[PDB]
Amino acid sequence: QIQHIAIVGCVHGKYREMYRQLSEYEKSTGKEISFVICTGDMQTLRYEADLVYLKVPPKYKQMGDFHLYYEGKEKAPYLTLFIGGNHESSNVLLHLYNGGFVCFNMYYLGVCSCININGLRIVGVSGIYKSFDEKKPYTYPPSPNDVVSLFHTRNYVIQMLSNLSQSSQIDISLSHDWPQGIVMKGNYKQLYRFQPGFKKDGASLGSPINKVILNTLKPKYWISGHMHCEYHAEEGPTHFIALGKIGYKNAISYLDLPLKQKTDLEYDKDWVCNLIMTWPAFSNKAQFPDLSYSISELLSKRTKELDKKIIELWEKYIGLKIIYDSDTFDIQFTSRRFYIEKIYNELNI
Ligand SMILES: [Fe+2]
Ligand SMILES: [O-]
Ligand SMILES: [Zn+2]
């Protein structure tokens, strides 16, 4: 059978319109949406105070729709998985850097992670690339002086994700800005006619971090947004798809993929092991990661016996299924790190 997955570019706080168009797809076609995938710019502002962390020009300092769903006045009709972009309540996403539900049916994948759903493995890479911030650590708790840098993709996510395709393939990978160089792998002459400003950047357009991750993992699909235009390219065996912003018709597309199994949203096994084995580099809650450690060196200590022990302890303390937690985000930050520390220390290394 077939599972219909909705892929969305930039939301920019227009959730009610997005879910309205998603419902018009289900009724005008008769097909059922399994779940929704968004490439970023979610602007998950809980209340007015969160506007400080929204890095936008003054004209875009707006609350958007998310607070209606956070308050429960609105309910997301589909399970929505998303990454962070450059227009975010960056304090919220920092609290949930290990992933988490921002409200019912809206799951943030964290700074980066892999999840499981309907037999698929989905990798997310949050943020946009700025070379001067790719080596900065994260400062916690969030400070209003970090609004300009919290949403910049850090280089270390490359080492966190590089081994994820060893056991099985990655079906879908998500980034906000494009993988660098992918613009030349499609009909770029046509793209330059509708987007003349893109031609001056040439092949250096996208993110070099997402370029490396794409070449390493080679997923079936790589989805991106940010650029407010539609685009499609082929990099070896990877189908690249770019989407626009909500409000225009190039914002939503649909992947019709085979459905072997219908399963609830679950943590990815290989990601959980990476998450536990890199705990020493994240043990300082005020500044992480501590790059005096080598993430590849920490991950080289993975064995099949330790991986099995890690999953046994993860299922005990957290559970394999990703379930909704309505605790405040600062509590979910401390809770998830508490159990990562507990599982690691029980391995005795
Ligand atoms: Fe963006
Ligand atoms: O954007
Ligand atoms: Zn955008």
Buried b (16+ CB within 10 A) or exposed e, 3-42: bbbbbbbbbbbbbeebbebbeebeeeeeeebbbbbbbbbb
Question: In the structure encoding, which two tokens stand for residue 80, read together?
Answer: 């929505």
Backbone angles phi, psi at 111, to 5 degrees: -55, -45
Nearest-CA residue for ligand 2 atom 1 is: 226
Method: X-ray
As annotated, the binding site for a divalent metal cation includes 10, 12, 41, 86, 176, 226, 228
324 in Cβ contact with 101 (< 8 Å): yes
Per the DSSP assignment, residues forming a β-bridge with 232 are: 241
Give the three-class secondary structure for 348.
coil
Task: Write down the H helix ranges in the chain.
Answer: 15-29, 66-70, 90-95, 157-161, 188-194, 208-217, 269-277, 295-299, 304-317, 329-347
> At 175, which helix (H) or strand (E)?
strand 172-175
Nearest 10 degrees: Cα torsion 140, 145, 148, 154: -30
- Measure the CA–CA gap between 64 and 122, rounded to whole angstroms: 27
Per the DSSP assignment, residues forming a β-bridge with 236 are: none
- Measure the CA–CA gap between 314 and 339, rounded to whole angstroms: 8
> At 137, which helix (H) or strand (E)?
none
- Measure the CA–CA gap between 172 and 245, rounded to whole angstroms: 20
41 lines ligand 2 (CB under 6 A): yes
226 lines ligand 2 (CB under 6 A): yes
Backbone angles phi, psi at 3, to 5 degrees: -110, 130
As annotated, the binding site includes 10, 12, 41, 55, 86-87, 130, 152, 176, 197, 201, 226-228
Question: In the structure encoding, which two tokens stand for residue 304, read together?
Answer: 């099949």
Q: How far is the CA of 169 from the centre of ligand 1 (A)?
A: 28
57 in Cβ contact with 12 (< 8 Å): no
CA dist 16 → 69, 107, 247 (Å)? 9, 17, 11
Backbone angles phi, psi at 202, to 5 degrees: 60, -140
Name the residue among 251, 237, 248, 177 with its Cα closest to residue 6.
251
- Measure the CA–CA gap between 328 and 313, rounded to whole angstroms: 24
12 lines ligand 2 (CB under 6 A): no
Instruction: Give the neighbor-by-neighbor strand order of the sheet with 106-108.
Output: 100-103, 106-108, 80-82, 33-40, 2-10, 252-258
118 in Cβ contact with 259 (< 8 Å): yes
148 in Cβ contact with 127 (< 8 Å): no
Within 8 A by CB and 6+ apart from 75, the residues are: 69, 104, 105
10 lines ligand 2 (CB under 6 A): yes
Q: Which ligand is nearest to the CA of 244?
A: 3
Q: Which ligand is nearest to the CA of 12?
A: 3
- Measure the CA–CA gap between 347 and 301, rounded to whole angstroms: 12
Q: How far is the CA of 328 from the centre of ligand 1 (A)?
A: 26
Question: In the structure encoding, which two tokens stand for residue 340, read together?
Answer: 């990562």
Note the resolution in Å, 1 decimal. 2.1
- Measure the CA–CA gap between 70 and 49, rounded to whole angstroms: 14
Within 8 A by CB and 6+ apart from 245, the residues are: 9, 10, 11, 12, 41, 225, 228, 251
Work out the number of other CB atoms within 10 angstroms of the CB of residue 234.
11
Q: How far is the CA of 228 from the centre of ligand 2 (A)?
A: 6
